[PDB]
């Protein structure tokens, strides 16, 4: 759906009212598709450096393949540089051809989580994950969550709309690694909006009542509020130190977007109360 | 003392310690969705339990 909406965005002039009707329908039923940050990251730059760089390095780049990536990336503690070579060429690749590479990166982020990897490789993985997010978001989210579960039941799409705190069920290694935590934040925000949509659909389906709308409001409010609380507990320094700054910055950004979207949630979070060790850094951040 | 908070109807109840558990509780309630839906977790009784009243409400 997202890729076809992007193509309609491109070919707005020919299509009379279809682009309008589809964008209204997605803004009605798929808000976790029509989040804003992915679309601005789609809009990008017209400095054309990406296009010139692609046209002058993709050439015949010795035919990098998902199986070759899988071999080198299973032998990655013996060989990091070949992996980083391959994913360099992958960032040079475009949005459409990236799809056969969706299986490998997500399902094998565990050895990335293992300590000792360079964050050039990590940020390359992060940028590729943004591009796959702007192409095929939903299966990308499913594979990312089912591969970021700690070391293994296999979650589904409906289960993720039912309970998005499963996104926060991940490694404390994920918690203390910066860019993978950004991936987790995107999945968290998306699945929160998705949960709003899914409870909307389930209540409108189950009608075959006023307490039901109030129960929806209560469940959603407590839902994103508990998500905020988990994020703040992540910002709490662990006993072991007694990376953290970048993690706190990312969580402060996500909290900023949630607060701007709904200041009721600020009221409810502050009535529930959170650790006052977290209080000053959140004051500085948000 | 006569506050009687509605944890299910209102979200400003449910203090921090029980938050996840009540969240799963409202979710289980709303996604069970039987003929009768309940707004209070602990509706045990008020003052007295009458056998005659129970038998009168029963057949």
């Amino acid at each position: 759906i997202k890729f076809l909406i992007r193509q309609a965005q491109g070919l707005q002039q020919e299509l009379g009212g279809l682009h309008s009707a589809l964008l209204r329908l997605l803004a009605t039923n798929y808000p976790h598709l029509c989040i804003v940050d992915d679309w601005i990251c789609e809009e990008e730059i017209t400095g054309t450096d990406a296009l010139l760089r692609r046209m002058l390095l993709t050439n015949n780049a010795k035919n990098h393949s998902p199986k070759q990536l899988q071999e080198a990336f299973s032998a990655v503690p013996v060989n990091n540089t070949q992996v980083m070579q391959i994913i360099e060429h992958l960032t040079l690749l475009s949005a459409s051809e990236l799809i056969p590479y969706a299986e490998v990166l997500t399902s094998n982020m565990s050895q990335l989580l293992n300590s000792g990897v360079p964050r050039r490789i990590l940020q390359t993985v992060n940028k590729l994950w943004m591009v796959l997010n702007t192409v095929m978001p939903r299966r990308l989210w499913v594979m990312t969550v089912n591969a970021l579960q700690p070391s293994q039941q296999k979650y589904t799409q409906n289960d993720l709309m039912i309970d998005p705190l499963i996104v926060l069920r991940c490694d404390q290694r994920v918690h203390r690694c910066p860019p993978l935590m950004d991936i987790t934040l995107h999945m968290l925000n998306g699945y929160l909006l998705a949960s709003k949509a899914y409870l909307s659909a389930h209540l409108k389906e189950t009608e075959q009542e006023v307490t039901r709308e109030e129960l929806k409001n209560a469940l959603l409010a407590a839902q994103d509020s508990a998500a905020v609380q988990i994020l703040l507990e992540i910002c709490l320094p662990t006993e072991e130190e007694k990376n953290l700054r970048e993690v706190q910055c990312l969580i402060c950004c996500l909290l900023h977007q949630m607060y701007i979207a709904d200041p009721n949630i600020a009221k409810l979070v502050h009535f529930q109360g959170y650790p006052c060790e977290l209080l000053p850094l959140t004051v500085a951040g948000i | 003392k006569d506050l009687k908070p509605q944890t299910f109807r209102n979200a400003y109840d449910i203090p921090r310690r029980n938050l996840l558990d009540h969240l799963t509780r409202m979710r289980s309630n709303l996604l069970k969705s039987t003929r009768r839906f309940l707004k209070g977790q602990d509706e045990d009784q008020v003052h007295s339990v009458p056998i005659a009243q129970m038998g009168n409400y029963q057949e």
Binding site: E214, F271 | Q6, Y12, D13
Partner: peptide, 8 residues
């Protein structure tokens, strides 16, 4: 549509 604590 609940903006605060219920009794107050």
């Amino acid at each position: 549509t609940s903006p605060s604590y219920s009794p107050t």
